[PDB]
Design a protein around this nucleic acid. Structure first.
Lengths: 142, 258, 187, 171
RNA sequence: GCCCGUCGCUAGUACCGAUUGAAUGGCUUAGUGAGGCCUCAGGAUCUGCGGA
RNA sequence: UAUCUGGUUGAUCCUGCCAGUAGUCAUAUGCUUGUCUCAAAGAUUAAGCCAUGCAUGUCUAAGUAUAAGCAAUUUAUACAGUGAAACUGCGAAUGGCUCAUUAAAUCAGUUAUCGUUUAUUUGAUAGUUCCUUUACUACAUGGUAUAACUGUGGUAAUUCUAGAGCUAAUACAUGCUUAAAAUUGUAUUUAUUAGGAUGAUUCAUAAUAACUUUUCGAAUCGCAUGGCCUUGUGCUGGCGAUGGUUCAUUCAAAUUUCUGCCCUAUCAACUUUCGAUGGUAGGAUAGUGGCCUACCAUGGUUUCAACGGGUAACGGGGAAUAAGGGUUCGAUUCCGGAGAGGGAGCCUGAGAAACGGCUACCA
RNA sequence: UCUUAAGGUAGCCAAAUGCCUCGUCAUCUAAUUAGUGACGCGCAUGAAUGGAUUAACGAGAUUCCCACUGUCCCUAUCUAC
RNA sequence: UGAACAGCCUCUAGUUGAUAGAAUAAUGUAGAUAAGGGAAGUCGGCAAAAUAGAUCCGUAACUUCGGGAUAAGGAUUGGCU
């Protein structure tokens, strides 16, 4: 999207009150956190204008469980991407490996600018959508 | 399965109960209590098969009902009360007094104690919170809850609880040197001292435990139970003092004490 | 009963899942409350675990909070004017969460007059000293300034009448009030 | 005929089946929650009836044999204390243990009076239980207050120790 | 010496085959749609302006 | 216990299969049949149909007993012991059986609940129940039923019951004895504020303004009957059982991360009308979630085998046979699923889509 | 073996061409000289005196099926002239 | 109105001409309707009935690949805001 307040509703962090009766500085009160496990919260998640209630840093979604790494293969959806987690399955009888791949839809916060082919690390969270269960926490590309 | 399960079969019973596999279809399913269904010793198996006092379940029930038997400081009458790790079971009519504890093989021992020690028990504080009205409280591994603990008492410590009244007699912290009781895992019943922990994020924490004979092993922090100072236990340990010698060493000891 | 299981939805790969188990109570859904206005009528629905839920219909009044002041008063509901999900709820005057509604202004107006001693639109010594201490508090923004003259306050409903039985809400203010007013006047 | 009772409320001269729930006539449930579809008859009186049960709201000028001429006395008198008080016109303070109905029963030659046990009857047992409840609550109140004060003093001592440690630090 | 195929008899197996062939099961468009449930009402009757 | 042998030829050397050999908690069957221990056993075809009779009922000292029952008030005039019948509370959602349906479904290992419900057990836990703010309260304590019963009956018939008169509660609908310590409980909901622990949180908890058709905060029961005198049926007083809100515990439940399944291209494109992938918002849920709904973008899977089809396919722990590799089987004693002829709906309950529970259709 | 100039080949058929004939078998129906599919020693089928098949088309001929109805069971009534 | 120099009604224009009056018998000619059944009628579904416009969905064998096709089979249809 382009404008912050796009949908038919007003986008704001729940239980965050601007207190419009105070003329303080910085003209905003954004609620963030640190996801833990050493995952650094980006400065875009620090200072940005979006809301994305599903963001692990600003939204009310907590990262816990399996931490995974993949390479994205699709970014056409809205604030959601699909990663191809390649792995080598092992057949015991023939005592050698075979190539296999899995696609796990992973939710992406606007704090990152992801591109097809990058390598992104994600973490398990509560079911975001029917198939989406993870959120991206770091990207890597060059 | 459209509700709670109220039956247990002999094969599905935990192995350390040491029930035989051919006498009866079912096993005594523990009722709800301070401890889990596993890693807990029912009074029926502590009497009928451990102490051999009663020959049948009906006689175990009669013993329980005439109120000779009291776990911790309170009399128990249910046939299959889940007496857990450090629970003290009295049997005041025969003047004995046991504290449950794991032998080095990994089973509930029949270790007997005196009343001067039965007047207390230890518990690994498993959670610390602030309850209602801002009051802090601790909850131990046997579901027992104590309000208003010392602020220095944190999770993974041990709290000494008087059976007369739930109150913190003292506590043992979790740090290098403390003697610990490995309650869980492949080292069920082993006793040693802590040299250092690992403290992984998210994953299960790890501790490196060495014993009197310097046999270093590793165990998850969820399966340890610190019980006293360095070589200074706060409880009396069963025979063997939590040292597991090899199979050949056990055979040699058996043949030498034949 | 309405089933909440995903065993009936098509798989992510378009695979038609097969009927595995008959429907179950621990995944049952219930019909929407569709709470209207006037002549409070709350039906109690038992929920799993022996809990109680207040399926509200025809609610009369609700507790609405002025977040800048911190106070909250019971107030009669004039009616919905904008709903982000569906305009049908606006048309039929349905009370659900995040509904932008008009409510009465007299309780909040009287509270403002008795707490700060000012007026919108248009006596004891302790009262005068209190108003002097609370001076420059009539700096309330032009939106609500004209709102109280209009006699109705725009508030967002923050409760779930189909769940809690109450239609509690909070007064629109500042940026969000301006956004919702712009949506109303977008023509 | 066929023994289907007339249901109070349904307005039709026929026999129709309803889902009879709890607290309704013509159906005695056997299980908690069960509702069985029985067959009843309408409140409309019709030629299809076999017996019609009537109650004499006002007696006529001539009596009947197994009727107003003859009365059958109430089998059991009041059993609760206040029911006995109201039925005998007792006041707030009269004893009720002596007015109780002493029904005479004779096993052959041995006769004895069986009186109902009085429930809701104030008794030293009940008063003792009430006093015990009061004592339990007040004891609990004292215990909680003293424990709260003790932990407050312990926390104050701990914070004083923390201040002493802060003073000791920084040389 | 061996051996091939047509034809003739017997037996078995499968195939094509008019019959808009026939059954059994699964899914499903469309039409009809019981039933319990939620809900708008209806309020017999019973009870102290009310309640069920 | 890392082994072979007979068979194409006049004879030979090979490929090659047929056959022989041995095992099978692998079945049937034929013949024959003394003893001991042990023991499978209507799965295969028909999850086909079922006569009949059983398999879920249950009480103590401790919910209600004036049975017009038994035995006694040798303890008692309200009762006192036992006790049918019945109301009440629990359980009947466990167990047992079968393997039909199921091919990322179940299931196994491994994860999460910072994503929720949880009867019961265990351990803690309601001076604010005068708050509608000191009699709403009768508080030496409150109200009405109604069961059980007698009598009148209907039906060929059912674990059918109507009309009448009785009567209790730990059944229902109410309701105080809480002083008053500070600064007004708890429960619900909304908005605002601070914030010992975790890797991490809007967490735990606390403070405000209120809302609530209002939850809970003991009118229950059995024993022991003791201490204080200003001796009154006064004041205090033990052992318990039952009940109760919140939190924790336990028994669990529901979802959930990764990985893994037989044969099929004579199944290559599939999902996307009207849910498909995702976003916003709301309902719904016990709770997350396209679980459902409205608006919006056009997405999601696939030759690393999708979608479709078959399975004589419940999955696993495991079984038989094997130098090493492996092959075949696993209906079935244990774990987890699913079913009660098919299918759906639902009451009660903490727990059911429950079938030895109902509702309807089909057979 | 007689004989012709050659002796009906490919094909097709009780066909609009088959006397016997309502041929024989199957299907369609309760019942079928009808329809269709087969069998062909075909009185007397058959190759631009064109053979066979053929999508579409047909105010052509024929059979069956669904719907539909006074065609009929079994008739009755109404209006105009 | 409607797709429409279709059908129906009206404007300018033109006619109101066709022997007429009274009754409402049979049989007629033309138009119709019929309960239940639904071709059993008859040589034969002859006559009649049924469907029908538009939008959306769905559409087989066969094929000369162009068609078959409006295949078959279903749903909606007004007014007003």
């Amino acid at each position: 999207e382009l404008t912050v307040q796009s949908e038919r509703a007003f986008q704001k962090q729940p239980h965050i009150f601007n207190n419009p009766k105070v003329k303080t500085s910085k003209r905003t009160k954004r609620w963030y956190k640190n996801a833990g496990l050493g995952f650094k919260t980006p400065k875009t998640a620090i200072e940005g204008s979006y809301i994305d209630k599903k963001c692990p840093f600003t939204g009310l979604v907590s990262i816990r469980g399996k931490i995974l790494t993949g390479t994205v293969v699709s970014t056409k959806m809205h604030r959601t991407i699909v990663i191809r987690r390649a792995y080598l399955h092992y057949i015991p009888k023939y005592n050698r490996y075979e190539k296999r791949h899995k696609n796990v839809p992973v939710h992406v916060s606007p704090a990152f600018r992801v591109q097809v082919g990058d390598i992104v690390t994600v973490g398990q969270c509560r079911p975001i959508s029917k198939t989406v269960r993870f959120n991206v926490v770091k990207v890597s590309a060059a | 399965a459209r509700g709670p399960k109220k039956h247990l079969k002999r094969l599905a019973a935990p192995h350390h109960w040491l029930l035989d596999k051919l006498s009866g279809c079912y096993a005594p399913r523990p009722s709800a209590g301070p401890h889990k269904l596993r890693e807990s010793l029912p009074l029926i198996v502590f009497l009928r098969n451990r102490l051999k006092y009663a020959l049948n379940g009906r006689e175990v029930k009669a013993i329980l009902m005439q109120r000779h038997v009291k776990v911790d400081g309170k009399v128990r009458t249910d046939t299959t009360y889940p007496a857990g790790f450090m629970d003290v079971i009295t049997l005041d009519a025969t003047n004995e007094n046991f504290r449950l504890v794991y032998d080095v093989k990994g089973r509930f021992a029949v270790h007997r104690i005196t009343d001067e020690e039965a007047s207390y028990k230890l518990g690994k504080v498993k959670k610390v919170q602030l309850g209602k009205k801002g009051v802090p409280y601790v909850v131990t591994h046997d579901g027992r809850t104590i309000r208003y603990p010392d602020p220095n008492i944190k999770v993974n410590d041990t709290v000494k609880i008087d059976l007369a009244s739930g109150k913190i007699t003292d506590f043992i912290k979790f740090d290098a040197g403390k003697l610990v009781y490995v309650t869980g895992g492949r080292n069920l019943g082993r006793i040693g001292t802590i040299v250092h922990k690992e403290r992984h994020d998210g994953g299960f924490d790890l501790v490196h435990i060495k014993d009197s004979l310097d046999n270093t092993f590793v165990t998850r922090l969820n399966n340890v139970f610190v019980i006293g100072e360095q070589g200074k236990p706060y409880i009396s340990l069963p025979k063997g003092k939590g040292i597991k010698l090899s199979i050949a060493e056990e055979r040699d000891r058996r043949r030498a004490q034949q | 009963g309405i089933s909440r299981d995903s065993r009936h939805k098509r798989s992510a790969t378009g695979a038609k899942r097969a009927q595995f188990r008959k429907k179950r109570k621990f995944e049952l859904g219930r019909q929407p409350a569709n709470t209207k206005i006037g002549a409070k009528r709350i039906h109690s629905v038992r929920t799993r675990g022996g809990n109680k839920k207040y399926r509200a219909l025809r609610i009369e009044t609700g507790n609405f909070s002025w977040a800048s002041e911190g106070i909250s008063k019971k107030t009669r509901i004039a009616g919905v004017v904008y709903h982000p999900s569906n305009n049908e709820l606006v048309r039929t005057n349905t009370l659900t969460k995040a509904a932008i509604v008009q409510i009465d202004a007299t309780p909040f107006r009287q509270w403002f007059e008795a707490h700060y001693g000012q007026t919108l639109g248009k006596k004891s010594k302790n009262a005068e000293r209190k108003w002097a201490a609370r001076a420059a508090s009539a700096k309330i923004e032009s939106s609500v300034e004209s709102q109280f003259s209009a006699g109705r306050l725009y508030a967002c409903i923050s409760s779930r009448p189909g769940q809690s039985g109450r239609c509690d809400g909070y007064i629109l203010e500042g940026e969000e009030l301006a956004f919702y007013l712009r949506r109303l006047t977008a023509k | 005929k066929q023994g289907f009772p007339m249901k109070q409320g349904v307005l039709l001269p026929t026999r129709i089946k309803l889902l009879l729930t709890k607290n309704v006539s013509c159906y005695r449930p056997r299980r908690d929650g069960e509702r069985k579809r029985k067959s009843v008859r309408g409140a409309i009186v019709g030629p299809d009836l076999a017996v019609l049960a009537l109650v004499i709201v006002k007696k006529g000028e001539q009596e009947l044999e197994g009727l107003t001429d003859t009365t059958v006395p109430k089998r059991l008198g009041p059993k609760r204390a206040n029911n006995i008080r109201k039925f005998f016109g007792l006041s707030k303070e009269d004893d009720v243990r002596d007015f109780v109905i002493r029904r005479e029963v004779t096993k052959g030659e041995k006769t004895y009076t069986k009186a109902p046990k009085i429930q809701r009857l104030v008794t030293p047992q009940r008063l003792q239980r009430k006093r015990h409840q009061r004592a339990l609550k007040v004891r609990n109140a004292q215990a909680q207050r003293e424990a709260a004060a003790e932990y407050a003093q312990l926390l104050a001592k701990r914070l004083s120790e923390r201040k002493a440690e802060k003073a000791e630090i920084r040389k």
